[model samples]
Target chain A: AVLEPFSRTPVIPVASPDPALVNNPVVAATEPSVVKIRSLAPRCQKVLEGTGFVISPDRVMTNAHVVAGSNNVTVYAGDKPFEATVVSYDPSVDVAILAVPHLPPPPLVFAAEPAKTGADVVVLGYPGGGNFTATPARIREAIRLSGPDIYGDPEPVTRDVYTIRADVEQGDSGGPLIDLNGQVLGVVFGAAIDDAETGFVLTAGEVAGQLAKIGATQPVGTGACVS
Target chain B: AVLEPFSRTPVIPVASPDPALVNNPVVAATEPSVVKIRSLAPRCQKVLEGTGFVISPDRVMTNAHVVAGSNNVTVYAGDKPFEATVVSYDPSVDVAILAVPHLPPPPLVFAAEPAKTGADVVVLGYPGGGNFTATPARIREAIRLSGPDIYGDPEPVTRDVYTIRADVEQGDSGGPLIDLNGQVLGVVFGAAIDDAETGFVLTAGEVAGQLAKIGATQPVGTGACVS
Candidate 1:
């Protein structure tokens, strides 16, 4: 009924990411652009981890649930951690934009066409928060998927998303699903618990409107964690 | 932990089958070959339903669990009901071959190559037991997946399967997953309960060994349902 990212375990696996993927040329070309995020909620004494990617020179985009109920947010590219300000948060679409003035890595470009079923995609993220991974996945469908709201209210949110066949583990949330050309196609959000190989992503087209208002958006408050 | 077909409801959807799919040349060409199977278990007072395709002139292949504990098995092609007898039952592989004295439809041909990730496939079945459907699905992976034995004992059977994005609902089990060329690829067995779009199929390669000894084996007794 709920997403795995919303209830990720605290203990991360110590195993390293796949060496074959680490040495892949596509992974090397796009790894720098992806970032790991840690949201600190002092009120509930919780430190949640997720992934995100650079959207602009100073703005990083991620899933809104990743930073929900946060008192402070920190984004990391390598070993360096940069403080982030929540610039835009939309629970309905499950997208959040953060401002990190001096973060490295250039913004990623969107793909020209919508993702078609049976297309291959490489998902970049810090799975289990141990190491960077570029998991290869295939698109199942790009359709309207109805699911729970980010804030866990009565009303449901039906949005454009992808049902993919890939292991989107903990801390992989808020990452990017890029095409073979390394162009953005979807934003990682949750995974189906019943099947280990199935994962879900919010399509880039669904977030185009929110991302278009990048500079115009003011700082938004991060509400308490969804129960 | 149980599959939907093992405990199918009595009432079926009254809605007609998808018109677009019915009109499709691929579906129309293959529809006559696919059939509806009804298994009557008078001991439990149950009538389990599934789909299967012609493997030989007088033999039909389906999931073992579909006909498990059956007192009488009837296969239908249009309005004609032909009595069937269980000829081969292998719970370890979840495959059962039935002998129909008089049945029409040419045998399906198996493809040479194994199904790979991101490949397109057409699943022919009678979903909801009302109308025939040809669902378009995409292959996610073909790997060794370990799960509960068909007999529901301590033993586990690990076999090669394709995790696909398709609705393999009630009466869909035992169907055939065919390629665009109308060649058999995988056999339907179960679906993921958490995601309606996800389904499980036993790869044709895994069942090749059992099928090679088709006529060599004799009829076996159908035990009580796996519970």
Candidate 2:
């Protein structure tokens, strides 16, 4: 089982003298914030893919496509794994739902206006190795949104916010594309180029907005996963 | 994707020799078949209906109201479409099994005696849509067995050869309402009057005799299309 975020406290460390400098506060809390997911076929034996994260301490979020054609999906928090069933999905968005019996802690999520251009971010997830990749993808990325692009790209593609540079790869499709403050920026979708060097990510705000429509709120602490 | 019966054959020609005999042969060729079905919600994806079937080559015989709230249904064949979603319908005669995925072929059935004022019969089914709609609708009437009339016009429901109507609709509601000759007869069901055009169809021999006990041979053929 992976270690969960600090359960005993909601400690937000005081900014040091150099507020802009980094002490890895998100890194310290990463253990509880990140999770692993695996999709099991209906027959319940073969593993489809693995990639999941702590949405709330209890709720975990991942790509529905990961489990779409399959029957059983298993969620892993720390080291414990739980069997899950599809609850719902927005096929248009390729987002699917999974229900689990037990809820883990310290779910991570996006905040209003999480970042602007030039903000530095980091992602933490299991890459396709470390043994756990066999079930779902591992490997996450840490990136920084650089200066405005000199190229005249489309509005949604290059005008506004875009994915920061991160070291993500296959099997990391659903991993948390997080910010330096340890907040989720988006979900890693897949490599944009296909060579696996860089990939596209789903904005955290997009998913959060969807949750809001359902009268749900992201998990602040740890209880059952859903709001 | 699996090539089942209907998968191999494109169309079971609904056009027959006599406009009356049209598709009757196909009905005779395949009538003892059943399909397990599940209805789904229209707006949000939810299961709204569920039922079974007794089919012919061109059509399936079942209660109409079964597919009322459903837009799509899953039908189950031998093991492949082992489920088919509902296609078209007719809620009145309480018969509306889908013509989706052609069904199994059984010996033809035809009303035996000229459906007279008096006769005997039986009803067979699994209650809800379970295994085997193979239950024969047998005869269970008395030449003068009298029962009070609910309409209270003072006419008793006492007739010759009335079989017991199975009260089981769990999975048996959508099967065929057949006659002794083993013909694809009326569809069986228990629904309200103001349902989807439900309270209108006549319980005549052409339709009802297919569900009678014995001594009944009425003209069997296709009816008008409301479509």
Candidate 3:
């Protein structure tokens, strides 16, 4: 069955995304850190209800919208739950920093290379609806929709704004999109507002540029990114 | 891109599965005992690829096709590999049991209920192709594909064979099809004939009926499955 909101909307009516835009080297290295965000009532009370990879042993990088507004937050680190604080955010750029602690040892590292145009751009995350959660009071065995606690969507962005044809959803905010060699391509910023089920990744250069502004330098990219 | 051997085939045309049949609680409970099979081929012989799942602390259940005509065979419990021996086999049923020493704890329990027509189901197993193996055979990066691993299709009937619409592949054989609450629904015994992408499952009832012959009592099914 189609999602309620999109059910009535024409499949082609949503803005079109070039299928080939996802190819970029930066997509792989940064995928492990992607996550989903659920903005709770009072609107500002948002919780990170999805998966995210560790960009730093104690820090996480994701889309700004994942932690937008004022309120509390939490991060699911796959193996466990973690209380987190949004240390930095840039809505215009769709990038944010989350300071986390008690992280599992040997946290995943961020990709170091800049995404090269036409390189294989990929993403890793848990989008919404793959799982089901229910208010027990409502029904027995009621399943709510959930995404992969961890999903790997490796592909290349063949166009501008760097897009890929992979299916993604709300909870996937703040995840990383990387390249074939496991280098940072960009953070999954979300699909461009006009597109359909397509995804938009912030260029790794954009994320690195943001980190530099905060007196931080992302680690060097790993492996050679191929076109 | 299409895989070798299947290069001429189209991804979308392969087959449509019943989304409702995947991950049902009864399925999980019934097949939770499913373990990953890693046949350490004779150090001198070629490795025959396959899958397996744990049934008893020391007994693993898998397709006889996995270890048939093998010189030396061992199994892997999850990620840990171990030495094992074939304990029994039923060629007609395409099932076999392997015995391992110092068996560890497992996550699967028997199914708690029976699956009804149109009930949901879930299948689990490691799919190849997503990870590229290097030439000298080193584990490379985890890749992603634009394809559906979980699918939905109505149950189909045949001459003495029951079938469901599930998306399965070569390596997915011998895995468990489960329910939302982690119940085993069936064993991925076979796929739709003449269709590699579509396959059939051995419902929990069949397993119960069969295992009963060997003194293995199948568990009951879970309630109707959900997301």
Candidate 4:
């Protein structure tokens, strides 16, 4: 086929963007900060891999489900692996922070300005335990949905998220959704089961408040490995 | 759920490329040149839309399937529309050129260097006719497959294509795959129906030989609006 027909509805105003706005200069600068995460579940003999980004020198943030097991956690930036401590974990929002001593990558910054409805974004991470990729994405919709932890929670918790139009896949979760400037806009959390072109991202603003508690919390167990 | 698992094998050596290589500086410069295509098939009461790029002020290029029907053609650059003629139509290669009297977008140049397997790319076009998006894409494989024209012809033709990992949607047909420097790499032609993350692009080299004939061809009727 030369191409398919147009059918998806437009979510934002149709305007050509300023190249300066979407041409990402900081992708290289932010590369090292995005690390590959591997955690082993001894009981299940499973090696779970996901992505995480350095927030502060001591903190690497990712989705809680990535390191939900009480197991060995190691983070690699393509060079060596570093052991980590689960500093802050919250499954309701699926956000988690890890304490990595002597973190190699410099910390990333959260964007002060919020992402627009039709903003062009870059999703950075090591997908499928392969080469690090900076995939192009578009912000389609922003909404808050409530649900209990799919990992294992009884009460439902509301989540602030964006429905993004991009090729986000497994192993991309916890990767920061950064603007072309490399400023954090959100985090890749879930993908559409029926639609490969659709994915879900947790907004950075939603996790900013969670970071405050990160500084005051103590190290916690990695918890049991999620089946 | 936060994330699934990492399993896809790496296609290229894992390396961090210069931000400049994949940053896409020429996207804005290339936008106006990337025009929207609309054709009316009076007999079928069907109006088809796709994307095309100006190769010369006198010529606009798109997939032949987008304008194959014997019909009326209009090219838009988000500005006023202009009537066009199907100057060169090659169903075997699915490449066609439209001669527009008042083409607004400037011509785009082909990149001298070929795209590597791991190179990051920017896909510019109107995906789904909603907004003009420059989606992020990565080259995975370069191969030549022989096949008869699905549009017509019985003789098999060898076509060069790249299996790209991106969210290239409908209405993006004939869109140019340009590097950050804005040089054309390939043209979006097909997508994997089973795997939404995968798409097929006709390489510039494969069509460069075809363009030489474009200069020698005469106006031809668009065969029919392809379904």
Q: Pick the candidate with the highest lDDT.
A: 1
- lDDT by residue (B149-193, candidate 1, tens digit) is 664434456999887876667888999988767888979888877
In terms of docking quality, model 3 is incorrect
If ranked by lDDT, best first, what sequence of candidates would result?
1, 4, 3, 2
Which regions of candidate 3 are displaced past 4 Å? A1-227, B1-34, B40-46, B112-114, B129-161, B209-227
lDDT scores of the candidates, listed in order: 0.77, 0.42, 0.45, 0.74
Lowest lDDT 10-residue stretch of candidate 4 chain A: A13-22
Which portions of model 2 show Cα errors greater than 4 Å? Answer: A1-23, A42-46, A129-161, A194-196, A212-227, B1-227
User: How high is each candidate's TM-score?
Assistant: 0.46, 0.42, 0.33, 0.45
Top-DockQ candidate index: 2
Q: For candidate 2, lDDT tens digit of each residue in A150-190? A: 11111112111234444455567566766666677777655
Better of 1 and 2 by TM-score: 1
Evaluate residue B47 in candidate 3 and report its C-alpha lDDT on the 0 to 100 scale: 49
Interface RMSD of each: 27.0, 29.4, 24.5, 30.7
List the candidate numbers ranked by TM-score, top first: 1, 4, 2, 3
Provide the lDDT at A103 for model 3: 60
Write one digit per residue (lDDT tens) for candidate 3, span A1-227: 85566443322222233344344333333333443334331222223454455666767676655554324556654435577665554433445566667765334444564443334344566667233111000001111212211111121112224455555566555565545555455556455355445565555555665564332332110100001
Predictions' DockQ, in order? 0.01, 0.02, 0.01, 0.01
Q: What is the C-alpha RMSD of each candidate to the true structure, in Å?
A: 24.3, 20.8, 23.2, 26.8
- Tens digit per residue, CA lDDT, model 4, B111-171: 8867888778877788776577777888877888677563333245689888777777889
lDDT (tens digit, per residue) of candidate 4 on A1-227: 67878775543432333334334677787888999988875433566788999998878999987876435778897578898877666656778888888887788898887677777887888889787887777787787756655343334568888877777867898899888777898889888777667778888878887787566334543433343
Question: What is the Cα-based lDDT of residue B53 in candidate 2?
Answer: 47
Docking class of 4: incorrect
